[PDB]
Amino acid sequence: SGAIYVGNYRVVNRHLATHNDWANLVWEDSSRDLLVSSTTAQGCDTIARCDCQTGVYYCSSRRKHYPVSFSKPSLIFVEASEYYPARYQSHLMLAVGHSEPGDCGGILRCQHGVVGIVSTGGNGLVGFADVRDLLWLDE
């Protein structure tokens, strides 16, 4: 679990969005596993606007942060799960690191701010849904 709170927006994994997220929907994209909902309170986070390919992510299944080198956002095949059919997930970045299903929502940060959230993983890989191109989150 986990979310990014920026301005009057809450960014979550689309497959983990609650009834309240869908009732306050701003934007969602099944191909990116992202959903953004509106909030009444001002958020605590800031979004990176950069091309970093190194950063640190929070891994809830280890209660620890790990440093990672990650690939640029791209279209990557993701096998079928209870949440989605087999498909290509866009704007996804992979890195070598530990993750389990409940780790989705953990934040990946670089020196400039939030880069994205854990969205996929397995066999010593961890995939992050990028949010750096969503310029409207700040404006």
Residues lying near ligand A1B5R in the complex (CB under 6 A) are found at 15, 33, 78, 81, 83-84, 89, 99-101, 103-104, 118-122
How far is Cα 55 from Cα 57, in angstroms, rounded to an integer?
7
Q: Residue 56 interacts with Zn ion (CB under 5 A)?
A: no
Q: Does 110 show up as a binding residue in the annotation? A: yes
Residues belonging to the active site: 15, 33, 104
Residues 95-114 that bind Zn ion (CB under 5 A): 110, 112
DSSP state of 20: H
Cα–Cα distances in Å, from 138 out to 1, 67, 112, 113, 124? Answer: 23, 26, 14, 12, 33
Query: Which single residue brings its beta carbon nearest to ligand A1B5R?
Result: 121
Q: Cβ 89 to ligand A1B5R, closest distance in Å?
A: 6
Stretch that binds Zn ion, among 10-18, 25-33, 51-59, 126-134 (CB under 5 A): 51-59
CB of 85 to Zn ion, least distance (A): 33
CB 35, CB 119: distance < 8 Å: no
CA atoms 139, 9, 76, 59: torsion sign: positive
DSSP H or E segment with residue 42: none
In whole angstroms, the minimum distance from the beta carbon of 23 to ligand A1B5R comes to 22
Residues β-bridged to residue 77: 88
Alpha carbon distance, N-terminus to C-terminus of the chain: 26
Q: Is there binding between residue 34 and Zn ion (CB under 5 A)? A: no
Is 50 assigned a ligand-binding role in the annotation?
Answer: yes
- Binding residues, by number, are 50, 52, 110, 112
